[PDB]
Protein backbone atom coordinates (compact mmCIF):
# COMPACT_ATOMS: atom_id res chain seq x y z
CA UNK A 1 0.00 0.00 0.00
CA UNK A 2 0.93 3.73 0.47
CA UNK A 3 4.69 3.55 0.89
CA UNK A 4 4.64 7.00 2.53
CA UNK A 5 2.58 5.71 5.53
CA UNK A 6 4.29 2.24 5.49
CA UNK A 7 7.71 3.90 5.53
CA UNK A 8 6.88 6.38 8.28
CA UNK A 9 5.49 3.65 10.48
CA UNK A 10 8.61 1.61 9.81
CA UNK A 11 10.82 4.31 11.28
CA UNK A 12 8.91 4.29 14.65
CA UNK A 13 9.56 0.51 14.87
CA UNK A 14 13.24 0.97 13.94
CA UNK A 15 14.63 2.21 17.27
CA UNK A 16 18.24 1.01 16.69
CA UNK A 17 18.27 3.21 13.58
CA UNK A 18 19.83 0.23 11.77
CA UNK A 19 17.32 0.23 8.91
CA UNK A 20 15.77 -3.09 10.01
CA UNK A 21 13.32 -4.39 12.65
CA UNK A 22 13.30 -7.59 14.64
CA UNK A 23 11.76 -10.41 12.68
CA UNK A 24 9.43 -10.98 15.65
CA UNK A 25 7.93 -7.54 15.18
CA UNK A 26 6.77 -8.30 11.62
CA UNK A 27 3.27 -9.21 12.77
CA UNK A 28 2.95 -5.92 14.74
CA UNK A 29 4.23 -3.89 11.85
CA UNK A 30 1.76 -5.59 9.42
CA UNK A 31 -1.12 -4.87 11.87
CA UNK A 32 -0.01 -1.30 12.40
CA UNK A 33 -0.21 -0.54 8.65
CA UNK A 34 -3.68 -2.02 8.36
CA UNK A 35 -3.63 -5.78 7.85
CA UNK A 36 -4.89 -8.47 10.24
CA UNK A 37 -2.86 -11.68 9.77
CA UNK A 38 -2.89 -14.69 12.16
CA UNK A 39 0.52 -15.76 13.58
CA UNK A 40 0.26 -18.66 11.22
CA UNK A 41 0.06 -16.54 8.08
CA UNK A 42 2.94 -14.29 9.23
CA UNK A 43 5.16 -17.32 9.90
CA UNK A 44 4.12 -18.95 6.56
CA UNK A 45 4.95 -15.73 4.64
CA UNK A 46 8.49 -15.69 6.17
CA UNK A 47 9.28 -19.41 5.70
CA UNK A 48 8.08 -19.27 2.11
CA UNK A 49 11.22 -17.21 1.55
CA UNK A 50 14.54 -19.02 2.11
CA UNK A 51 16.39 -15.71 2.11
CA UNK A 52 14.23 -14.31 4.99
CA UNK A 53 13.62 -17.67 6.66
CA UNK A 54 16.58 -17.51 9.07
CA UNK A 55 17.30 -13.78 9.05
CA UNK A 56 17.46 -12.04 12.38
CA UNK A 57 15.97 -8.69 11.29
CA UNK A 58 14.20 -7.38 8.20
CA UNK A 59 14.67 -4.22 6.24
CA UNK A 60 12.01 -2.01 4.69
CA UNK A 61 12.73 -3.27 1.18
CA UNK A 62 12.50 -6.93 2.30
CA UNK A 63 9.15 -6.26 4.02
CA UNK A 64 7.80 -4.32 1.04
CA UNK A 65 8.73 -7.26 -1.25
CA UNK A 66 7.06 -9.69 1.16
CA UNK A 67 3.84 -7.62 1.04
CA UNK A 68 3.77 -7.41 -2.78
CA UNK A 69 4.17 -11.16 -3.25
CA UNK A 70 1.52 -11.96 -0.69
CA UNK A 71 -0.75 -9.01 -1.44
CA UNK A 72 -3.94 -10.98 -2.03
CA UNK A 73 -3.69 -13.15 1.05
CA UNK A 74 -3.00 -10.01 3.15
CA UNK A 75 -5.78 -7.95 1.58
CA UNK A 76 -8.14 -10.83 2.30
CA UNK A 77 -7.54 -10.44 6.09
CA UNK A 78 -9.24 -7.08 5.94
CA UNK A 79 -12.36 -8.17 4.01
CA UNK A 80 -15.77 -7.39 5.32
CA UNK A 81 -17.41 -10.28 7.08
CA UNK A 82 -21.12 -11.20 7.14
CA UNK A 83 -21.04 -10.80 10.92
CA UNK A 84 -19.92 -7.19 10.59
CA UNK A 85 -23.28 -6.33 8.95
CA UNK A 86 -25.80 -8.57 10.66
CA UNK A 87 -25.84 -6.06 13.61
CA UNK A 88 -27.59 -3.48 11.52
CA UNK A 89 -30.52 -6.03 11.27
CA UNK A 90 -30.33 -7.75 14.64
CA UNK A 91 -30.96 -4.56 16.63
CA UNK A 92 -34.45 -4.42 15.03
CA UNK A 93 -35.17 -8.16 15.00
CA UNK A 94 -36.41 -8.39 18.62
CA UNK A 95 -37.49 -12.05 18.40
CA UNK A 96 -34.39 -13.11 16.36
CA UNK A 97 -36.45 -14.47 13.46
CA UNK A 98 -33.54 -13.83 11.14
CA UNK A 99 -35.98 -12.14 8.76
CA UNK A 100 -36.72 -8.53 7.74
CA UNK A 101 -39.71 -7.38 5.71
CA UNK A 102 -39.07 -5.96 2.27
CA UNK A 103 -40.78 -2.73 3.47
CA UNK A 104 -38.41 -2.33 6.41
CA UNK A 105 -35.34 -3.13 4.35
CA UNK A 106 -36.31 -0.58 1.67
CA UNK A 107 -36.99 1.95 4.43
CA UNK A 108 -33.61 1.40 6.10
CA UNK A 109 -31.69 1.45 2.82
CA UNK A 110 -33.44 4.52 1.31
CA UNK A 111 -34.24 6.54 4.46
CA UNK A 112 -31.01 6.33 6.52
CA UNK A 113 -27.27 6.85 6.21
CA UNK A 114 -25.97 7.42 2.69
CA UNK A 115 -29.43 6.88 1.27
CA UNK A 116 -29.94 4.56 -1.70
CA UNK A 117 -32.84 5.36 -4.04
CA UNK A 118 -35.88 3.26 -4.80
CA UNK A 119 -34.43 2.62 -8.18
CA UNK A 120 -31.13 1.15 -6.72
CA UNK A 121 -33.19 -0.95 -4.26
CA UNK A 122 -35.42 -2.20 -7.11
CA UNK A 123 -32.35 -3.33 -9.05
CA UNK A 124 -30.81 -5.03 -5.96
CA UNK A 125 -34.04 -6.93 -5.11
CA UNK A 126 -33.88 -8.78 -8.51
CA UNK A 127 -31.20 -10.95 -6.90
CA UNK A 128 -32.99 -11.44 -3.65
CA UNK A 129 -35.47 -14.02 -2.46
CA UNK A 130 -38.67 -12.49 -1.06
CA UNK A 131 -41.25 -14.76 0.86
CA UNK A 132 -44.94 -14.79 0.21
CA UNK A 133 -45.03 -12.96 3.52
CA UNK A 134 -42.86 -10.25 2.02
CA UNK A 135 -39.88 -11.37 4.21
CA UNK A 136 -36.18 -11.70 3.43
CA UNK A 137 -33.56 -13.83 5.17
CA UNK A 138 -31.08 -11.05 6.03
CA UNK A 139 -27.93 -13.20 6.59
CA UNK A 140 -28.47 -14.75 3.23
CA UNK A 141 -29.03 -11.29 1.73
CA UNK A 142 -25.75 -9.95 3.29
CA UNK A 143 -23.76 -13.12 2.25
CA UNK A 144 -24.86 -12.62 -1.36
CA UNK A 145 -24.02 -8.97 -1.46
CA UNK A 146 -20.52 -9.74 -0.13
CA UNK A 147 -19.84 -12.84 -2.37
CA UNK A 148 -17.43 -12.41 -5.31
Amino acid sequence: SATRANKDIFTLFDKKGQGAIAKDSLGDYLRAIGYNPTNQLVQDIINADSSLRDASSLTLDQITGLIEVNEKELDATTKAKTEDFVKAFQVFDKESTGKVSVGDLRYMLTGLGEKLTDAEVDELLKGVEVDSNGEIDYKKFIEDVLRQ
Binding site: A80, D84, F85, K87, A88, V91, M108, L109, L112, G113, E114, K115, L116, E120, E123, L124, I142, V145, L146, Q148
Partner: peptide, 25 residues
Protein backbone atom coordinates in the same frame (compact mmCIF):
# COMPACT_ATOMS: atom_id res chain seq x y z
CA UNK B 1 -22.41 2.19 15.32
CA UNK B 2 -25.77 1.26 13.78
CA UNK B 3 -25.89 4.11 11.21
CA UNK B 4 -22.26 3.52 10.35
CA UNK B 5 -22.86 -0.18 9.77
CA UNK B 6 -25.86 0.68 7.58
CA UNK B 7 -23.66 3.26 5.72
CA UNK B 8 -20.93 0.70 5.09
CA UNK B 9 -23.56 -1.73 3.83
CA UNK B 10 -24.88 0.96 1.41
CA UNK B 11 -21.32 1.41 0.08
CA UNK B 12 -20.95 -2.34 -0.58
CA UNK B 13 -24.35 -2.38 -2.30
CA UNK B 14 -23.36 0.57 -4.55
CA UNK B 15 -20.18 -1.30 -5.60
CA UNK B 16 -22.23 -4.47 -6.22
CA UNK B 17 -24.50 -2.31 -8.49
CA UNK B 18 -21.67 -0.75 -10.54
CA UNK B 19 -20.16 -4.25 -11.03
CA UNK B 20 -23.45 -5.53 -12.47
CA UNK B 21 -23.48 -2.52 -14.85
CA UNK B 22 -19.97 -3.25 -16.13
CA UNK B 23 -21.14 -6.72 -17.21
CA UNK B 24 -23.96 -5.34 -19.44
CA UNK B 25 -21.57 -2.96 -21.23
Amino acid sequence: SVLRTITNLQKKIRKELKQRQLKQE
